[PDB]
């Protein structure tokens, strides 16, 4: 397993982030404990979860499945860099009670409390904003986070679904008064959706943020998903699959291996449903995509490159 | 129910703010609870109380009623933006013991823990200064609030009855060292009394404060007092000059099919920078009359007619100079 | 002549501010100097060229006076108000006319809510560093504009406003709400503009030897000052000199009697009795919030 | 003529920006733009355009005093944004403009090799000598605007006041992060190439009466020209009127070289596109909205 | 009973600060409680003490007598501004074990918890430095005090026996990083010893500190010394100062201990003196001296018998 | 000639400071010899006393380049005190009398309790950045004035005061209380004015052929002790100061090559433990506050 610094900070993480999305809704508590044990022994120390994981009326179940994983002992909690999220509605799906979503100091305080409880731990290592909230200013947001830091309840703060200028505003506001700003951005990034390259990824590079990609198979589309509706992308997908057949490669492992070559990308979040899915993703980290394959991938999946070159000059 | 951000911050608050002066004094515990449950049903999520509410030897009784209300479970605490106040003398009425009123770090420490205890909750959402205190400098005041914030005892800090320059000084002072400044001002603002427009409301609008209007009926003087003539407003109607003012107001509203109470709240909702009035329902029926006042549309003829009965100074320096 | 520090700063000034054809202002300025009045204020260019013709007569004139002037406007874009663009041209045309290489107190004519304080202070600091300006003052501001302005300046070490020039007299006391308390908190001198309320306080009912509720105000005023032997224009000036935070009033005498009239007013000491009487004819609003709530 | 504040600052500009492309013709239009009330002058749609301005000022009549004058900044350090290239750039520019100060001194493009403490040193020196009042950007990313004004404000300096970006109906990707960042920081937004190089200027009816060889683009402009053929509007005016409806857009750069092109842009400033027309224009030329919703959620 | 803002801050205190150094050593616990109820009853809320008061093997005792006074209930703790101190050795007298005196953050941490436990209360209102420590820098000091502040264990920080430049340096350091600085200086200042007027009181006044004057009778020297003859100062320079003091006050029919207290109350910048009653009669004597009015004629006399130096540099150049 | 850094800063000055005399020609000759003895620190403790240095600089010979030039700032309002108005007018008048485009050490004459430090530092910062002055000093400050001034300068990044010129001699030592301790804390040089107390230390009684009630007795013990030791009164008054912690050195105003030569002999004279013990006996100090008046 390959390691790297989470951007600029002293945290050392695995280049695969174990996504726990399915633990609860699609994969059961027992086998999820098995999948997390497999990850640990394969060298993966960076686990990503979210309060809202569990879904519907079980929003929260994933944070409990990790909580009961830690409760078995074995230095499991001590070994894991535990990240979870705040922003999402923890009420019944739909228009939330005011202040029970977004990033007010109010929702941050009540969300961290609920998440620490389900997780059976006194601290989160990486507490990420699940989305930008344009109505909450950064002096408020950093007040909330800093309180959780001073009480030892969180260590680092990360972002997800931010614009590049949010990363800059956040970390300049925090640096002004002596606070560690964002250390990571969790952005949507894969071969089919590459527009985080325009501003999101260069911003995070300028300010020293880790970059972790979610939907790294783009909802499974890059996962060999023709094998038994718009024709254009169907064709993009068909040629991606033909190209990999000529080269003897699995579509799943290339989507992941390809993110692992992009500049500034710490690693994708892999969401395995079985252990064979974890295993398969671990081999993607040993895969070395040639310059022949990389070149012909960028032909089928063109990127925009940075702004303002993307759209102007 | 209309929602709005409370000034610049991430807090979303209903544009009606449930005041709680009456709970204890004029409404007993049981009915107070029933009205609060009704506010949540009507979407009001923003509750305003104060330590001194409760009167005389019974000051703090209002907070205890919200506390027993929270104790029934049901996400009552988790659902409401809880706001209360510090400044007031909680001793027997009259000249307070030194440091038992106003905004020293001493009074702030003692007031907050007694409020938290009476409210039976581990945090206040909006901790408001009840009045400007000119003897306490802002590095002391922000020291006191910042301790409360870092301990998780309070979230947001508001002012009530401040001057314009007090809001500015407070929030520049906070900003220098990275503190969230005041998030809201609670000013006396209604039709008959519009001098908050001179400097208070412009300052709060510059510094990104919500504006919460208290005494929105002017002591009931706008709630149809003269037709109910079939404390402040009592001997204020014994002004010949002034009782024609409230006369033209009640005559106008009769022509237009409108209720004097509801138009006082609805008007405040048209003023620029006003988050919403504080309503003081003593029954669920008067709550329900306030909720209708938040959905009324005040047409341009009415507002024209209102502004000429109730003249406003507008902002300084233009209000006394040019 | 009574002198005072201009608010918090080290600048000492007389408590009359000498305000506002050519040669009959030159003689009145020289005797204002003889009276000990060093605070000269241009409160549009002939007056500045006229003060400019004064300094060019040698003899310690630019070295003895505190020189104050204002920005222009009350138009073409950026030719009024307080942008860096107008500040720059306003000051450079003011230095031309005044015939001097620096202005002592450079004032804003009025509040410009569309121009941010980081812009304004940049433009003043360029002038302070080039020796073109020493001190900045405000005119017709709200109390919260003073706070915001001096707080903004102090963040980066600049000296903020040292003075606010507002409308303030017995007929109009509404600067006591917030303007003057802000000025007092931040240590600005308060300069009373129109101390006689356009001469309304200077004995106007009598000069009819030549609104019904507002002339009864002035009637009770003069009738009061008849029975106490006092001169009306002088009391209006002496009444401002007793208000806390007031540095002094702008006066522009052109005779030698009005100069002596104004000097007497700055020496006149009003008995407590008359102060009480004037208070009931011309009530004051108090500072906010107490003025309109509690 | 509609005026407005240039972002957060107290400078008032007309919503038409007078940009560029012999001197007599230039002078007359500049005199006529001033007659129409245009005060915002810029030397870009950076040689000879500057001296045509310097000799226009040389005619007196308060010309210099009436315009907000904006200009902008390969052997090493003869391009890009080192303090070295800025120092030589502005002095050359000052001499060619025949004036002792530029009102709005803009970067031509972001320089990712130059840090902002060096850029703001160089800008601040010029500020304190009085050579320069305001600073603005061209062709930045959203995240360069934030990094810039954040670094300026740490020490009291005025940040960027404007950003000149490629914005028109056909190319709307500045809406993702560029324009969002400038509204947050209070920068005027100056839309460069508001017709997309004439592509929006009735280019198909002028082909009878370069990007046109692509059928997908060709149909897009055909729908555009048909819609205004039914609505009574001139296409070159719509393209500017549309931009004037976008939040944070100060105005477009217009380069009229004749009175007839001038009355055409003034008229553009005064149109009111109906909600029907805006709705149709948005189905023809869709925008991406802001990040991250543009590509995630 | 007159009240005043403590310097520039919001805290209101009595112009008499109740000295407690006699509570325990000389006056007993039961009678120290009675003196303290009478001080409440007389309007005094400013109680001053120190961890050391008690002396010798009994250092800490005074703090305990306030604790058991607070444990009587009756809103005694809630009515009182509690001031204690840190600097003095709390262990066996003499050379202190290293860091068991002075103002390292290590000594600060251990002194506040031991004073909190003796005082029977979770917070001190005014934590004072008992003396300047030139060896501890102010980033160290304000760190330790700020920790106490943010834990809610202390409200205000004050000094005692500083120079003027120590006050300046501390309050400027605290302000850089937003912290409320010194709120009070407790200096030695009476008729015999006026040299605090040179720099201590001007600096204190510049920075908005209350000035609390300790040893206001100069160890009894101003407490009717010779008439009571029925420190040493058998030096004849001081007994003429003091003879002409007592005979002037007997020409005018006045109490020596009362004038010493009434005098300090007229000095500009002085919040008030610390009065140290041993009995409740001595408490009522001090209360009287606080509504005493000394004529502008007597003050001339005292000033030519106890000449002040005034402010530096004027005090020794021009 | 012994040198020393002026307090905390990189300026290296001679331990003797050439003070103000009172003839152009005769002042010029002292100054040229002062240069030859290695004294580089010139101060003007203003009218003719400044234009004489100016005629001196105009002779050339690297006289301005070798010299660290120091100078200072009822009256008409704002024609004394330290208002920004008066500083800009004083420095203009000084720069022109002095026939030079910069002052090295611009010093305040006296504390002014009515001008704030953000006003003063505004004025001094203007001159620094125009190259008109380099270093700021103070004279006749209290200790807390030094502390306040330099804390205010450091907030927004200015060099603070670099030196304090205080009254400090054997007879008057109350600057050891707070002013010299403050200057020592903030890294200022301490420049001693009136090192002989108006001449009282350079042999007042052995030249009788101001001050004489109580003070005569101690001046006799002084002169007697120095007779019995073979030391000169003036030279010792100056040499004593050079042993005092934080003291850069004393202002000397020699009006004759001899006096300059005597001042120089004072700077390399080494007082013994016994003389030092005896002088403190005759002229006690109060030590630092608070110990001086408390404990």
Numbering used by the authors:
A (entry chain D): 1 to 228, 247 to 331
B (entry chain H): 1 to 230, 240 to 331
C (entry chain A): 1 to 20, 28 to 50, 59 to 89, 96 to 231, 248 to 331
D (entry chain G): 1 to 21, 28 to 51, 58, 60 to 86, 96 to 231, 244 to 331
E (entry chain B): 1 to 230, 244 to 331
F (entry chain E): 1 to 22, 28 to 50, 59 to 86, 95 to 230, 246 to 331
Can you list sentences taken from the study reporting this PDB entry?
Aldo-keto reductases (AKRs) are a superfamily of oxidoreductases capable of reducing carbonyl to primary and secondary alcohols, found in all phyla. In this work, we identify the enzyme AKRtyl, which is responsible for tylosin reduction. Phylogenetic analysis indicates that AKRtyl is the founding member of subfamily D within family 12 in the AKR superfamily. Specifically, by combining steady-state and transient kinetics, X-ray crystallography and molecular dynamics simulation, we demonstrate that AKRtyl exhibits a positive synergy mediated by an unusual Monod-Wyman-Changeux (MWC) paradigm of allosteric regulation at low concentrations of the cofactor NADPH, but an inhibitory effect at high concentrations is observed.
To obtain the apo structure of AKRtyl, we remove the carried cofactors by denaturation and refolding. We successfully obtained two apo structures of AKRtyl without any cofactor. The first apo structure is similar to our previous second purified-state structure, with two octamers in an asymmetric unit and one active (R4) and one dormant (T4) tetramer per octamer (R4T4). Unlike the classical MWC model where different conformational equilibria occur in the actual oligomeric state, AKRtyl is actually octameric, but we observe symmetric T and R conformational equilibria within the tetramer. We therefore propose that the basic unit of MWC-type allosteric ensemble is a tetramer rather than an octamer for: (1) The tetramer exhibits ligand-independent T and R conformations, suggesting that the equilibrium between the T and R conformations occurs within the tetramer.
